[PDB]
Amino acid sequence: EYLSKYAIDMTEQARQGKLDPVIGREEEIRSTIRVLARRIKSNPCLIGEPGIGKTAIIEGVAQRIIDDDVPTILQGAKLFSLDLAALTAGAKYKGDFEERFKGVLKEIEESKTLIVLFIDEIHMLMGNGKDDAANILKPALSRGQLKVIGATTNNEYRSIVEKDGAFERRFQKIEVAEPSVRQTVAILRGLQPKYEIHHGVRILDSALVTAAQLAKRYLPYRRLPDSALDLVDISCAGVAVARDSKQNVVDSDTISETAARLTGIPVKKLSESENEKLIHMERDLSSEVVGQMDAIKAVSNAVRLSRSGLANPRQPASFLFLGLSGSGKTELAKKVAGFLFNDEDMMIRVDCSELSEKYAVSKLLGTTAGYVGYDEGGFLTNQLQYKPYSVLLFDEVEKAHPDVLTVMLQMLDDGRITSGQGKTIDCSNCIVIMTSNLGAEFINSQQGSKIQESTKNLVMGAVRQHFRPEFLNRISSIVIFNKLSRKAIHKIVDIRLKEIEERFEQNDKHYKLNLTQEAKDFLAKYGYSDDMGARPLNRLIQNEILNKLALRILKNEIKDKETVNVVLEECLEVLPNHE
Amino acid sequence: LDPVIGREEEIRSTIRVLARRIKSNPCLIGEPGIGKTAIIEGVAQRIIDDDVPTILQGAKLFSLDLAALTAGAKYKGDFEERFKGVLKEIEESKTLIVLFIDEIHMLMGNGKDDAANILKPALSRGQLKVIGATTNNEYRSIVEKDGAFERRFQKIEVAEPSVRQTVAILRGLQPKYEIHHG
Amino acid sequence: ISETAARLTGIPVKKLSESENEKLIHMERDLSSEVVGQMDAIKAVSNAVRLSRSGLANPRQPASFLFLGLSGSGKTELAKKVAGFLFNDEDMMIRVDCSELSEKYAVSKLLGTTAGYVGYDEGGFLTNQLQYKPYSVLLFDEVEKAHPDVLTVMLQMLDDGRITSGQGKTIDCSNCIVIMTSNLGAEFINSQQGSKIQESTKNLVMGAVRQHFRPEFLNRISSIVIFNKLSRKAIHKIVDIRLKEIEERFEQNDKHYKLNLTQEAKDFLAKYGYSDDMGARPLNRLIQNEILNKLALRILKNEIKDKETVNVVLEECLEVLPNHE
Ligand SMILES: Nc1ncnc2c1ncn2[C@@H]1O[C@H](COP(=O)(O)OP(=O)(O)OP(O)(O)=S)[C@@H](O)[C@H]1O
Ligand SMILES: Nc1ncnc2c1ncn2[C@@H]1O[C@H](COP(=O)(O)OP(=O)(O)OP(O)(O)=S)[C@@H](O)[C@H]1O
Ligand SMILES: Nc1ncnc2c1ncn2[C@@H]1O[C@H](COP(=O)(O)OP(=O)(O)OP(O)(O)=S)[C@@H](O)[C@H]1O
Ligand SMILES: Nc1ncnc2c1ncn2[C@@H]1O[C@H](COP(=O)(O)OP(=O)(O)OP(O)(O)=S)[C@@H](O)[C@H]1O
After folding, report:
1. Which residue among B17, B78, B148 places its CB closest to the CB of A153?
2. Where in this protein does the record put region NBD1 (chain A)?
3. In the CATH hierarchy, which fold is given to the domain comprising A271-483?
């Protein structure tokens, strides 16, 4: 009776059509059967990554028995799935759980046709460093009795073997593999009617294909038999939800949207409104960043290329921004994040300006087991796992120690980067921007505005002297920022003045600066340092205007709508009815 | 319970996952202090107002304590019994019962083992829907060790709401504070 | 018995199928159809694979290579195509990011950490992969960046396949292939004195190797292999290959080429992408810069839905099918 209380009759579940129909995996199913067909230690075990179909194989075998597709040894056999229930019943009256366990084995053992016992999470039976693990399945399997099928993960197997020894002897591992995308789809097709029936939705074959493809590309941490199903099942659920208050059909687009929600990857949304945003991306960035159109275009291409799906799945977009300091290198990256997340600071930043090798590698990746801290991934690993397509910005990669840059070297080509604790993170479908001021050395030759021939040669000469080709050749594009022209300065001043207004927390403490009057000319004239980019503008605005404004505010001379003009420098007005 | 403001996508996504045939176990993930458990209660409120997908229409949502795990361990195995009991009561399906586990990493177990089948193979059967809640750090401490949980549960990213959203939230909660403080 | 063992260990060596004979005696043919030129590297690998598959390989020496060459010459690529062949899946490869192998961590990262210390997740990458997939190809990217202490561990691994784990177990990764890559000789290959790396230049490369790795390691590699700089002719073939891969990776295959200019475009790219010291990488870049980016706009603008055509611009451009929908 024990067997009916502490285990599930998997062959009955197969008989009743409750188990997912099993598709493919013939070598694996066959191997399990062949091992069960053994006489001594007829004890197979399915080992492999958590999502590859281990119990599906077991269920498959249950079906093969029901379907009369087994050896005469197995024909007429019954398969049970052992629960922990026998053990959960309690260790009250010391050893009784072992007796119940033994009772299960005894019922099985006494020739009630051939009974095979299967155990989920079988590593649990390694018990208390042996001891409580008792004789669980030990003399049983040793004598070839009580045929057992076990299944667990790679890591658990490692723990079983390591800690027990004897179990390794008793069990015959069978490796189970993740199916290919094509195989995955075939499986999905096989499962399709169960999903369609459950949800009450129709699934197009295109959708099934789509899910497997997307799963391979966008759910790297979880194996295809699961990941593809999550996309199918969830997409179906999506449709099922629509059916609650609103065409019950799942297609590739539904899945792609679902994937975007699931993974955070915006590439899969596919909207007409997106198209307009991307088409005019350059305009929007040019209204934030003045000039530097080549840089704007360079990035825009990365985004558009990625959003179209054309970007190579293994080549994170990668840019190196060379250019004269203050030309807007960091600023561009921020504005790109602005565009992509509606948040200039959403991006992941790596302050490479601070990277002495000894520490630098570990700061980005973290430690291996056994070292101080296991809170791995200071910056790259931890951030990449939650914001997998975000903009990753490296400030002054030029100054990073040459060795830490080789972490980036790897990151930049074929996604993979691994944590200190051993996980592949894979910064794949994302954008990487790196910065350097190295090129300033030649740009400051004042060769007009747009970078000229020779200037660019020297800039690239220097970058070649500084970084090894191994790195440079992995960059999608090296962009050299242009010098800002006085004309650019006029545009910049406008933008800056607008940002100043927008950032005011107190919506009264703002200007009506006569920026249409000589005030803009003053700023453009005085702030145009040929070689400090736009930075002098921030300083002039503070020295010429905001500092004075602060005083006007402190003295309560200001309510709102402050105005500015120039005398002989910038001068602020007061509101005449004030002190 | 306090009302939930915004977070519509989170509520929708959570339920959508619960609507799944198998492994219908969403988990909220994000930095602490962002409203993860608020979302969970938001779902409870949608259930009370019944503004939910068919699968939840008349469903219950329970928050599991660790008392199930820890309230006495003489007669080792009793906590396992507590879980088989609880999980069985959920499986009973008097109505649809969804279980919420706060601090979901707490069921990881000391070197697993204790973890038993607490919410393990059962989740793949379509019953015992579980909603989790964790942080990036906790998540890593579960996932990198269990493997199977990473598969069983489906994380949902939960963003820090923007300042704009924050204000809306504050307005929404304003009367609770005004009433409490007077 | 042999077949049974193959089933249990996964090792194809023991299957002995006739169909393998053709794939193996022609492995070079097929690798050369993926990797252009670089025949010595191709032969080097194929010989190792064949010794294993034919049952001649010595169990105490995992096959190993040290591939030297210019970046963009196909070092990583070859290894992947080989893994592709061996498993019918390039993702089966076990990879090591050697650039991450700073002294204090690298050993423990690959082998694991000893009992008593935080985390017993031994095996990080090597033990954990090797204990399940015995004949996986290992790939070490830029081994010259690994701290010498790490390279020392490889020396141990490269004989008897014996590697100890952090917790004291052995791996015995006998029947496998180990690929190490390096850019140390790039400085001499860049002399461009030839097509096939020239003799003598070859010794300069050995010089770079000998001054970086200790001899104790170097004489242990089954063979040190040097990739050739790519020739212009190679580039023509490479371009063709990339264009095919590009079409193949279009998972949403409405987005596909007819390409057109089936000579002219390829020649344009071959001409412009033939950078003497950057291997094939510039070809990838030109295609994105000159073609795919433009395609992205044609897609975004609803100008092209399928049947993509490239024209020469006297650069290159794409022709609109639907009229800007
Ligand atoms: N070949 C297949 N045939 C039928 N169903 C499959 C197949 N592969 C996967 N599935 C489904 O997707 C899952 C595959 O993995 P499962 O066996 O459920 O999980 P697992 O691989 O057993 O890992 P554990 O041991 O349960 S953590 C199953 O739960 C099935 O629902
Ligand atoms: N081309 C530009 N358009 C608009 N604003 C700009 C531009 N260039 C610089 N700025 C201003 O420059 C400031 C930030 O410049 P950054 O990009 O940080 O300096 P940089 O160009 O990165 O040089 P480094 O490397 O950071 S010294 C912002 O306050 C911007 O307003
Ligand atoms: N969107 C929201 N609508 C209404 N109230 C909210 C919202 N977000 C947060 N709150 C309130 O803000 C508080 C913080 O939320 P919590 O869920 O406690 O934080 P948390 O994200 O759960 O952090 P942990 O993980 O539980 S420490 C909650 O107590 C809610 O009452
Ligand atoms: N001979 C070749 N035939 C075909 N493709 C090639 C060839 N050489 C290089 N490639 C391409 O180069 C890219 C992969 O880079 P690799 O050439 O392996 O870089 P590498 O040669 O490994 O130098 P490292 O060590 O990775 S910097 C792929 O896009 C390959 O297709």
Report:
1. B148
2. 3-246
3. Rossmann fold (3.40.50)
